[PDB]
DNA sequence: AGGGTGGGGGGTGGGTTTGTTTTTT
DNA sequence: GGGTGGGTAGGGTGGG
């Protein structure tokens, strides 16, 4: 027999057996004999202040503290451009200010406008509002400005900041408000014209954030209605002319920066000076990227490497003319798919012996490289004494390793920091002088066709290289090392892809309609680098299925509440159903956690211990979002004992104190909006009146399934075959796997063979980052279109033509009819919210449904 | 994303993870 | 080579 014939036929025999085994593993759905009678019976019934500011400023000029602080402000490069910055702003409506690193344009341009208005006399008719891209940056900048003017932030002074759940608002007339980009967008709902604001300043707009792009376009549109409004942009050199052309060829400023001189060494220079010989047998390559990445640029990437291959032979010949032959072969036979950790380890060794005192900071793409490099350094004998200290940096590290990096060190310590791209944004070490830049960064994309979000490693853009280089020469002259040849440095991308072209455009689509800006499709055409038509059409269609939008995008009453809730549309529906079923407190904690981070932090050395503690918190719920509730519940009880007990609890279970505190403040915000709508009767999320079904884990799982319904996976289990194995499938993805960080990674005793996930990614294989099992009743009611069929087994009932259970015809008919009554009741309740009373006979469909979910179940199959 | 108790027919088949950032009154 | 490793994540120009 042919080899292909026997192999192909063998699959058919195995495939038939597998199909014939899944049909016998379907869960049976039946309730009772007495319960059916109850359901059937119910179903049959269906002026002087302006001048006072000038006097106050003159009096403050004699303060000793103010004079001392003013002397330092003179050294800033932006001080010399005070005449030009103030005069041009008062003339043109739109101005662009571009400056290199070192000039304090963020803390000086804002003060220049206020000082000019106060001195000229009409200083009470201005209100400068400055937008910052980070919560920490807003706080730090405001405090620095307050100390510069010899005042205190907030408390009715001339400066302040406002962020989420924290606002030290200054006085009304004059004053400066530093707020994140999100705050300004929320203001547009009340007053779309942004009145009572004289100057609006947008800084750090070169990062091309998601919310920054929306605000910039809205301001441009609003400019016509408000001729007297002045808006100032702040880019960072490079491609600063793009913003000028967008706004209509506005004037530009080129404020020079200030930085100590630095020297840049490429791959050829580093190898030649340190004489690095690669290890033998290390050239064994791997699969040549057998993934076929579907990135947005795709063809742009395919093009750039084409020139690189073409110019490769020419560049190599020129290199041999200058450098030695030994270094030429090393750079030629170097893998470009991964950073050479051996080269970095050798480079750090050379710096210690030869170069002078300083701090070394190295950028790495991800955790895998951070843990690998830390092993190479710790393995060697030299990097083990008390002299050298290594402080890894990552988001998952406990409180970014506290404040060890901030503290200075005596001579000889030579602290070494291994960090991801978290240190380049805002970490303020203020001590490093040698910077090693592994030219690889991790980017998150989104495929409009596969409807999945991937994550891979990409070469750093020319802007990222400049940002990393600028962290060395700030307080002392230093050195910057780049791990790529001169050919790569010329072919690097000028900028990263804007966030508007990546990430799903789901929350942004609802934000457009709540602001009455346009028609979603028309508004997403004046944005710089507008998204592709495929992504816009898919987002609208997905919202239509969720029923957040009408047949002609009219913002159905359900969608109104989703837009005003600062969460994703899927998460927002979970919050709304939590108040309807009176399971408020546990649901709010899950929604807050799903919206922003988890309170679990894993240190470097202890990775296996951290996973063991997380499984202990899960108890026997076989759930991932229920561990957050269990962790939060324990933390609250521990805090009652005392402050000392709370610290011990977080350390024992590797929890994060700051994240848990933020999650507690987020819960109160959600309940405040619900009270205004009318779903609840109090602002306290832990109201005993609205926490009736709060101690039941079955009701909570049903509510979660109501929110994240379309994401459902199968737990098809293969019996035997040595150790037990579980294969997880998806309707549109084929075969997926559970991420090792999840609780259910190694679980093989699932009561029901179904899951619900929230976040999935295609880093290397399709992964589910969190999943919880669901009973069949949780899918029958809060699911798709119920259908009754017959496939020679029984009166099988399907919710989406692929989720199939087993039930008799009589029972299945009752369940389908009950679902129809619930949908009508649920729609009416959302349109006219009410606290709902559990001591009446008006609409008891919810009461009957709760009894079915709470009781019965226990299929265990 | 299968085992090493198949076999080393090939590695151009595959053999566990983990950029950061944001939201009125 | 095996077939309970998979052909809904390998291939037959790898073998039976």
GROMACS .gro file of C-alpha atoms in nm, chain A residues 479-802:
model
  324
  479UNK     CA    1   2.826   5.665   2.602
  480UNK     CA    2   2.547   5.506   2.398
  481UNK     CA    3   2.577   5.164   2.234
  482UNK     CA    4   2.357   5.039   1.950
  483UNK     CA    5   2.351   4.671   1.853
  484UNK     CA    6   2.306   4.699   1.477
  485UNK     CA    7   2.527   4.769   1.178
  486UNK     CA    8   2.531   5.095   0.984
  487UNK     CA    9   2.307   4.945   0.715
  488UNK     CA   10   2.022   4.895   0.963
  489UNK     CA   11   2.061   5.247   1.103
  490UNK     CA   12   1.981   5.390   0.758
  491UNK     CA   13   1.685   5.158   0.686
  492UNK     CA   14   1.512   5.207   1.022
  493UNK     CA   15   1.155   5.336   1.018
  494UNK     CA   16   1.112   5.706   1.088
  495UNK     CA   17   0.826   5.643   1.333
  496UNK     CA   18   0.618   5.363   1.478
  497UNK     CA   19   0.272   5.292   1.344
  498UNK     CA   20   0.017   5.529   1.504
  499UNK     CA   21  -0.216   5.369   1.757
  500UNK     CA   22  -0.511   5.480   1.541
  501UNK     CA   23  -0.407   5.223   1.277
  502UNK     CA   24  -0.383   4.942   1.535
  503UNK     CA   25  -0.613   4.816   1.817
  504UNK     CA   26  -0.987   4.754   1.769
  505UNK     CA   27  -1.188   5.069   1.698
  506UNK     CA   28  -1.482   4.971   1.917
  507UNK     CA   29  -1.479   5.213   2.211
  508UNK     CA   30  -1.381   5.499   1.979
  509UNK     CA   31  -1.685   5.432   1.757
  510UNK     CA   32  -1.921   5.477   2.053
  511UNK     CA   33  -1.727   5.785   2.168
  512UNK     CA   34  -1.797   5.960   1.836
  513UNK     CA   35  -2.174   5.920   1.864
  514UNK     CA   36  -2.195   6.027   2.229
  515UNK     CA   37  -2.017   6.353   2.136
  516UNK     CA   38  -2.241   6.408   1.828
  517UNK     CA   39  -1.928   6.473   1.621
  518UNK     CA   40  -2.048   6.302   1.303
  519UNK     CA   41  -2.140   5.965   1.154
  520UNK     CA   42  -1.853   5.742   1.270
  521UNK     CA   43  -1.748   5.679   0.909
  522UNK     CA   44  -1.733   6.048   0.815
  523UNK     CA   45  -1.546   6.152   1.130
  524UNK     CA   46  -1.285   5.879   1.076
  525UNK     CA   47  -1.167   6.050   0.757
  526UNK     CA   48  -1.026   6.383   0.882
  527UNK     CA   49  -0.788   6.208   1.122
  528UNK     CA   50  -0.420   6.204   1.030
  529UNK     CA   51  -0.347   5.859   0.885
  530UNK     CA   52  -0.712   5.748   0.890
  531UNK     CA   53  -0.784   5.379   0.953
  532UNK     CA   54  -0.853   5.142   0.667
  533UNK     CA   55  -1.209   5.096   0.544
  534UNK     CA   56  -1.202   4.726   0.638
  535UNK     CA   57  -1.138   4.802   1.006
  536UNK     CA   58  -1.412   5.067   1.023
  537UNK     CA   59  -1.678   4.848   0.859
  538UNK     CA   60  -1.595   4.549   1.081
  539UNK     CA   61  -1.620   4.757   1.399
  540UNK     CA   62  -1.964   4.890   1.301
  541UNK     CA   63  -2.090   4.540   1.220
  542UNK     CA   64  -1.962   4.400   1.550
  543UNK     CA   65  -2.140   4.676   1.743
  544UNK     CA   66  -2.460   4.599   1.549
  545UNK     CA   67  -2.455   4.236   1.667
  546UNK     CA   68  -2.400   4.352   2.027
  547UNK     CA   69  -2.710   4.574   1.975
  548UNK     CA   70  -2.526   4.885   2.095
  549UNK     CA   71  -2.615   5.057   1.766
  550UNK     CA   72  -2.944   5.085   1.579
  551UNK     CA   73  -3.008   4.982   1.218
  552UNK     CA   74  -2.879   5.324   1.103
  553UNK     CA   75  -2.639   5.405   1.391
  554UNK     CA   76  -2.892   5.589   1.608
  555UNK     CA   77  -2.750   5.493   1.951
  556UNK     CA   78  -3.021   5.260   2.083
  557UNK     CA   79  -3.097   5.321   2.454
  558UNK     CA   80  -2.879   5.025   2.554
  559UNK     CA   81  -2.583   5.183   2.374
  560UNK     CA   82  -2.625   5.515   2.557
  561UNK     CA   83  -2.523   5.359   2.889
  562UNK     CA   84  -2.230   5.174   2.730
  563UNK     CA   85  -2.086   5.496   2.587
  564UNK     CA   86  -2.098   5.684   2.919
  565UNK     CA   87  -1.930   5.399   3.110
  566UNK     CA   88  -1.547   5.429   3.090
  567UNK     CA   89  -1.504   5.063   2.993
  568UNK     CA   90  -1.521   4.843   2.684
  569UNK     CA   91  -1.868   4.765   2.544
  570UNK     CA   92  -1.837   4.400   2.649
  571UNK     CA   93  -1.736   4.498   3.003
  572UNK     CA   94  -2.006   4.764   3.023
  573UNK     CA   95  -2.282   4.510   2.961
  574UNK     CA   96  -2.151   4.299   3.250
  575UNK     CA   97  -2.179   4.596   3.487
  576UNK     CA   98  -2.536   4.669   3.378
  577UNK     CA   99  -2.645   4.309   3.433
  578UNK     CA  100  -2.474   4.301   3.773
  579UNK     CA  101  -2.712   4.561   3.916
  580UNK     CA  102  -3.010   4.390   3.751
  581UNK     CA  103  -2.937   4.055   3.919
  582UNK     CA  104  -2.831   4.223   4.249
  583UNK     CA  105  -2.481   4.069   4.234
  584UNK     CA  106  -2.309   4.408   4.236
  585UNK     CA  107  -1.993   4.393   4.448
  586UNK     CA  108  -1.829   4.077   4.303
  587UNK     CA  109  -1.914   4.184   3.946
  588UNK     CA  110  -1.771   4.535   3.990
  589UNK     CA  111  -1.440   4.392   4.112
  590UNK     CA  112  -1.417   4.168   3.805
  591UNK     CA  113  -1.509   4.452   3.569
  592UNK     CA  114  -1.254   4.685   3.729
  593UNK     CA  115  -0.984   4.417   3.706
  594UNK     CA  116  -1.065   4.336   3.343
  595UNK     CA  117  -1.053   4.708   3.261
  596UNK     CA  118  -0.707   4.773   3.408
  597UNK     CA  119  -0.446   4.517   3.518
  598UNK     CA  120  -0.450   4.245   3.785
  599UNK     CA  121  -0.318   4.266   4.142
  600UNK     CA  122  -0.079   3.975   4.083
  601UNK     CA  123   0.293   4.050   4.050
  602UNK     CA  124   0.559   3.785   3.986
  603UNK     CA  125   0.919   3.856   4.097
  604UNK     CA  126   1.221   3.739   3.898
  605UNK     CA  127   1.353   3.452   4.108
  606UNK     CA  128   1.018   3.321   4.236
  607UNK     CA  129   0.812   3.226   3.930
  608UNK     CA  130   0.692   2.879   4.032
  609UNK     CA  131   0.607   2.986   4.388
  610UNK     CA  132   0.389   3.272   4.264
  611UNK     CA  133   0.184   3.041   4.040
  612UNK     CA  134   0.127   2.800   4.330
  613UNK     CA  135  -0.018   3.076   4.550
  614UNK     CA  136  -0.253   3.192   4.274
  615UNK     CA  137  -0.392   2.839   4.238
  616UNK     CA  138  -0.451   2.830   4.614
  617UNK     CA  139  -0.664   3.146   4.593
  618UNK     CA  140  -0.875   2.991   4.316
  619UNK     CA  141  -0.994   2.719   4.561
  620UNK     CA  142  -1.216   2.479   4.359
  621UNK     CA  143  -1.406   2.734   4.149
  622UNK     CA  144  -1.217   2.640   3.828
  623UNK     CA  145  -1.229   3.010   3.743
  624UNK     CA  146  -0.986   3.289   3.658
  625UNK     CA  147  -1.190   3.602   3.732
  626UNK     CA  148  -1.307   3.450   4.062
  627UNK     CA  149  -0.951   3.454   4.198
  628UNK     CA  150  -0.951   3.835   4.177
  629UNK     CA  151  -1.268   3.842   4.388
  630UNK     CA  152  -1.114   3.597   4.636
  631UNK     CA  153  -0.790   3.798   4.651
  632UNK     CA  154  -0.980   4.125   4.695
  633UNK     CA  155  -1.205   3.975   4.964
  634UNK     CA  156  -0.906   3.853   5.163
  635UNK     CA  157  -0.728   4.188   5.134
  636UNK     CA  158  -1.028   4.378   5.272
  637UNK     CA  159  -1.059   4.142   5.569
  638UNK     CA  160  -0.684   4.164   5.637
  639UNK     CA  161  -0.691   4.545   5.633
  640UNK     CA  162  -0.949   4.541   5.914
  641UNK     CA  163  -0.698   4.381   6.153
  642UNK     CA  164  -0.443   4.657   6.101
  643UNK     CA  165  -0.188   4.817   5.873
  644UNK     CA  166   0.080   4.562   5.968
  645UNK     CA  167  -0.148   4.270   5.878
  646UNK     CA  168  -0.228   4.421   5.537
  647UNK     CA  169   0.140   4.444   5.443
  648UNK     CA  170   0.199   4.081   5.543
  649UNK     CA  171  -0.098   3.960   5.336
  650UNK     CA  172   0.025   4.130   5.018
  651UNK     CA  173   0.379   3.995   5.060
  652UNK     CA  174   0.264   3.640   5.133
  653UNK     CA  175   0.041   3.614   4.824
  654UNK     CA  176   0.257   3.833   4.595
  655UNK     CA  177  -0.019   4.093   4.566
  656UNK     CA  178   0.020   4.459   4.468
  657UNK     CA  179  -0.089   4.717   4.725
  658UNK     CA  180  -0.108   5.010   4.482
  659UNK     CA  181  -0.310   4.814   4.225
  660UNK     CA  182  -0.556   4.690   4.488
  661UNK     CA  183  -0.606   5.043   4.623
  662UNK     CA  184  -0.676   5.171   4.271
  663UNK     CA  185  -0.922   4.887   4.211
  664UNK     CA  186  -1.107   4.991   4.528
  665UNK     CA  187  -1.144   5.348   4.403
  666UNK     CA  188  -1.257   5.228   4.059
  667UNK     CA  189  -1.546   5.034   4.213
  668UNK     CA  190  -1.688   5.346   4.378
  669UNK     CA  191  -1.681   5.535   4.048
  670UNK     CA  192  -1.883   5.265   3.872
  671UNK     CA  193  -2.153   5.263   4.142
  672UNK     CA  194  -2.180   5.643   4.132
  673UNK     CA  195  -2.280   5.642   3.764
  674UNK     CA  196  -2.524   5.354   3.817
  675UNK     CA  197  -2.704   5.550   4.090
  676UNK     CA  198  -2.744   5.848   3.856
  677UNK     CA  199  -2.897   5.628   3.587
  678UNK     CA  200  -3.129   5.467   3.844
  679UNK     CA  201  -3.024   5.099   3.844
  680UNK     CA  202  -2.927   5.108   4.213
  681UNK     CA  203  -3.050   5.310   4.511
  682UNK     CA  204  -2.719   5.396   4.680
  683UNK     CA  205  -2.363   5.494   4.594
  684UNK     CA  206  -2.211   5.224   4.817
  685UNK     CA  207  -2.121   4.917   4.606
  686UNK     CA  208  -2.153   4.698   4.918
  687UNK     CA  209  -2.516   4.788   4.992
  688UNK     CA  210  -2.687   4.487   5.157
  689UNK     CA  211  -3.007   4.569   4.970
  690UNK     CA  212  -2.838   4.532   4.628
  691UNK     CA  213  -2.621   4.232   4.729
  692UNK     CA  214  -2.883   3.957   4.756
  693UNK     CA  215  -2.725   3.700   4.522
  694UNK     CA  216  -2.369   3.802   4.611
  695UNK     CA  217  -2.258   3.484   4.791
  696UNK     CA  218  -2.344   3.247   4.503
  697UNK     CA  219  -2.067   3.155   4.260
  698UNK     CA  220  -2.317   3.014   4.008
  699UNK     CA  221  -2.502   3.344   3.964
  700UNK     CA  222  -2.179   3.540   3.919
  701UNK     CA  223  -2.065   3.305   3.641
  702UNK     CA  224  -2.400   3.348   3.465
  703UNK     CA  225  -2.369   3.728   3.470
  704UNK     CA  226  -2.013   3.711   3.336
  705UNK     CA  227  -2.131   3.487   3.052
  706UNK     CA  228  -2.397   3.746   2.969
  707UNK     CA  229  -2.128   4.007   2.905
  708UNK     CA  230  -1.862   3.804   2.724
  709UNK     CA  231  -2.094   3.573   2.530
  710UNK     CA  232  -1.937   3.560   2.179
  711UNK     CA  233  -1.605   3.437   2.323
  712UNK     CA  234  -1.680   3.070   2.396
  713UNK     CA  235  -1.440   2.776   2.373
  714UNK     CA  236  -1.473   2.398   2.395
  715UNK     CA  237  -1.298   2.165   2.640
  716UNK     CA  238  -1.298   1.856   2.417
  717UNK     CA  239  -1.105   1.602   2.626
  718UNK     CA  240  -0.906   1.308   2.486
  719UNK     CA  241  -0.928   1.014   2.726
  720UNK     CA  242  -0.628   0.791   2.782
  721UNK     CA  243  -0.311   0.856   2.581
  722UNK     CA  244  -0.070   0.849   2.878
  723UNK     CA  245  -0.134   1.161   3.090
  724UNK     CA  246  -0.470   1.333   3.049
  725UNK     CA  247  -0.474   1.608   2.786
  726UNK     CA  248  -0.723   1.882   2.702
  727UNK     CA  249  -0.769   2.047   2.361
  728UNK     CA  250  -0.942   2.386   2.345
  729UNK     CA  251  -1.122   2.482   2.024
  730UNK     CA  252  -1.289   2.796   1.891
  731UNK     CA  253  -1.553   2.857   1.626
  732UNK     CA  254  -1.342   3.091   1.411
  733UNK     CA  255  -0.989   3.017   1.538
  734UNK     CA  256  -0.965   2.637   1.511
  735UNK     CA  257  -0.737   2.514   1.790
  736UNK     CA  258  -0.618   2.740   2.073
  737UNK     CA  259  -0.431   2.687   2.400
  738UNK     CA  260  -0.461   2.814   2.756
  739UNK     CA  261  -0.185   3.052   2.864
  740UNK     CA  262   0.042   2.912   3.139
  741UNK     CA  263  -0.034   3.216   3.357
  742UNK     CA  264  -0.399   3.110   3.378
  743UNK     CA  265  -0.529   2.904   3.670
  744UNK     CA  266  -0.682   2.633   3.447
  745UNK     CA  267  -0.358   2.562   3.257
  746UNK     CA  268  -0.308   2.216   3.411
  747UNK     CA  269  -0.666   2.143   3.521
  748UNK     CA  270  -0.822   1.830   3.372
  749UNK     CA  271  -1.137   1.774   3.584
  750UNK     CA  272  -1.377   2.027   3.434
  751UNK     CA  273  -1.740   1.970   3.529
  752UNK     CA  274  -1.861   2.128   3.203
  753UNK     CA  275  -1.673   2.140   2.872
  754UNK     CA  276  -1.711   2.510   2.795
  755UNK     CA  277  -1.521   2.832   2.860
  756UNK     CA  278  -1.547   3.209   2.830
  757UNK     CA  279  -1.238   3.422   2.766
  758UNK     CA  280  -1.175   3.796   2.740
  759UNK     CA  281  -0.827   3.854   2.593
  760UNK     CA  282  -0.666   3.635   2.326
  761UNK     CA  283  -0.343   3.689   2.135
  762UNK     CA  284  -0.127   3.532   1.865
  763UNK     CA  285   0.225   3.588   2.001
  764UNK     CA  286   0.350   3.244   1.896
  765UNK     CA  287   0.032   3.036   1.922
  766UNK     CA  288  -0.326   3.146   1.983
  767UNK     CA  289  -0.359   3.179   2.360
  768UNK     CA  290  -0.637   3.238   2.612
  769UNK     CA  291  -0.511   3.454   2.897
  770UNK     CA  292  -0.807   3.377   3.125
  771UNK     CA  293  -1.100   3.137   3.103
  772UNK     CA  294  -1.378   3.013   3.329
  773UNK     CA  295  -1.616   2.720   3.292
  774UNK     CA  296  -1.990   2.778   3.246
  775UNK     CA  297  -2.292   2.561   3.317
  776UNK     CA  298  -2.527   2.488   3.024
  777UNK     CA  299  -2.801   2.705   3.176
  778UNK     CA  300  -2.567   3.006   3.178
  779UNK     CA  301  -2.536   2.971   2.799
  780UNK     CA  302  -2.897   2.880   2.717
  781UNK     CA  303  -3.043   3.206   2.852
  782UNK     CA  304  -2.761   3.458   2.798
  783UNK     CA  305  -2.666   3.320   2.458
  784UNK     CA  306  -2.751   3.308   2.088
  785UNK     CA  307  -3.058   3.193   1.899
  786UNK     CA  308  -3.210   2.883   2.059
  787UNK     CA  309  -3.286   2.605   1.810
  788UNK     CA  310  -3.436   2.258   1.855
  789UNK     CA  311  -3.316   1.976   1.630
  790UNK     CA  312  -3.305   1.596   1.614
  791UNK     CA  313  -2.991   1.407   1.507
  792UNK     CA  314  -3.099   1.050   1.601
  793UNK     CA  315  -2.965   1.105   1.956
  794UNK     CA  316  -3.234   1.315   2.130
  795UNK     CA  317  -3.412   1.650   2.094
  796UNK     CA  318  -3.079   1.831   2.095
  797UNK     CA  319  -3.098   2.205   2.168
  798UNK     CA  320  -2.840   2.439   2.014
  799UNK     CA  321  -2.774   2.804   2.098
  800UNK     CA  322  -2.545   2.891   1.806
  801UNK     CA  323  -2.569   2.579   1.581
  802UNK     CA  324  -2.241   2.453   1.734
   0.00000   0.00000   0.00000
